[PDB]
Each structure stands twice: as C-alpha cells, then as structure tokens.
C-alpha cells in the first residue's frame, strides 16, 4: 500500500477463453478473484498500457499476499485467469480516472 490508490468496487467482467472448460472454470472461481484494483496514480504514467501493466502486477500481488494470509491457495491457472480479469478492471479503472 506504500504509494498506491485503491479503486472502488466494480462488477467483475466475464472473460471468454475459447473453451467451455475455461469459461466454466472462470465463472465458478471468479468470486475468489479481485473486484477492486490497486494502482499507482494517473500522473506517473505516459500511457494507458504502462498504467494497466503495473495495476495488474500490484493488484495480483496484494491479492495473493492477503488470500494466503486467510488460508487460501491459487493454482497457476488461477493467476493466468486473474491476470485476464485484472487487466479488464485496470482498463476500467484508467477509464474512471480520466472519465
């Protein structure tokens, strides 16, 4: 949390992967994934992609260094699938930030 903003809650988007197993998987596991992003402020960024990249890395770390505190565990597919949904949310957050 040293230097970050935390965005408000957003409805988790649906991600499609091109297999029914993956779609089904995500849809049943999505409650375990973030619904708010951590990010660094707008004005540190030259462009929206650099913003999104970081926002993904940071959120993912903060969510996993707090779920493992609970007692939770994530498969390597979960983090694949988290990267996907956190990307969309971060894109939404950049969008809120500029409007």
């Amino acid at each position, epitope marked *: 949390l040293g230097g970050y903003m935390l965005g408000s809650a957003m409805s988790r988007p649906i991600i*499609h992967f091109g297999s*029914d*197993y993956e779609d*089904r998987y995500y849809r*049943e596991n999505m409650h375990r994934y973030p619904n708010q992003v951590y990010y660094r402020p707008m004005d540190e960024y030259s462009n929206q992609n650099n913003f999104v990249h970081d926002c993904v890395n940071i959120t993912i770390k903060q969510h996993t260094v707090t779920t493992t505190t609970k007692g939770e*565990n994530f498969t390597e597919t979960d983090v694949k699938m988290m990267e996907r949904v956190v990307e969309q949310m971060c894109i939404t957050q950049y969008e809120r930030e500029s409007q």
Partner: antibody
Amino acid sequence: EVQLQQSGPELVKPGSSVKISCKASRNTFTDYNLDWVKQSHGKTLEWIGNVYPNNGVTGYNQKFRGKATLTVDKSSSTAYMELHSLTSEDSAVYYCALYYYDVSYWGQGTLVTVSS
Amino acid sequence: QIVLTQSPAIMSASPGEKVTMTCSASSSVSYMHWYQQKSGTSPKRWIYDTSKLASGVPARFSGSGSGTSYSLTISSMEAEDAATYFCHQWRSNPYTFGGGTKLEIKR
C-alpha cells in the same frame, strides 16, 4: 490414461443417508473438475454439483442442496457424495465425471437402491 | 435452467445414411456438448465444445451450432453408432442435459 473408480452399489433404508466415493487413479492433472450426475431408471440425467479438488470450490444444483453434500480428500485423490435423508426418488445410478480440458472421464456409476 | 430439447426422441436409420439429430436450447448457449450412452455402460463424452470429437470417437461424427440451435451428424450411419445421445450445456448453473435421442440402425 486416468482411471475413475466409484464405490460398489449401496442399499439404504429410507430416511438413512449414504456416502459414495470416487477416485482419480493415475491422475497427473493438478486441478480438474469433478461432476456428479444422477440418472434415474436408465434414462434422464441431472447434474448434481461439482468440486475442483485441488483446492476448494464446490457448486450445487439448487435442486440437490440439502440432498447431496460434496467433499474431497487429496490425502487419497478421492471425492465423496453424501446423499442425505433418502427416499425412493433417490434410487438411481450416480455418475462421477472428471473434466480437464479436452480429456473427459466418467466413472462406472454407483447404483443406489432405497428400500427396506 | 437452460432447457435442452432433443429431437427426434427416437430415430431409426438405414446403414450408410447421413443422420442428423437436433438439440434446441431455451436460452442462448456458447458451446454444446454431446454424450453417447449404450445400454449397460455409463455415458461418455462424444463431442465437446460444439464441434470437437472426444477421444476415440469416429471421424464420421460432427457437431455444429450456435445460440439456441445445435446438431450432431453421423455422415455415414454405422452399426456401432446405435445408441442414445444426450446434449449437455455449461452456460449456467444448473447445467442441464437433453432428453436424449435414441438412434437405431436398420438391418
């Protein structure tokens, strides 16, 4: 490659409960999905619920909440369905179905009879 | 509770015939799956993700579809294919099964 064996056929007195099992044998899939499916009188198939064994998540058909409880045990790659409070309607063949992407494996079915 | 409705309910075909069975959905689904069941054995996935054949399923089989309309086709009807086929969907809890098409060969 993976074998799915399910426990032998049960006979239960009405009002009792039974726990049938199902184990991934020679499974190398870290995660994967286990479907439980009931088939009555040799035709109609109804989805009961599922578990992703490694680790946690459980989903139910509304219809079967309070009827089936689903749990797992990776101290032995075995999944469990507790059927609660059995009536003659619960007499069926209950299937175990492993899904991991392209691969699919269904067990051999466990036949429950609910009788005296 | 997407309702899968298969047709026909029972269907006799002559050998070498093209054979098409349908599965109609109450609401739109993204992929459809098909299982084959011969009496005695347990159901076994036959087609997954609408069009992909499960392992060891013969090549004369195919599936297609989108939205609310999905089909399964045997390009050339063969004795081993005589069985009951069910459709299945993974779009919403509860995942549901078709009523099953029973397919018989003529001889």
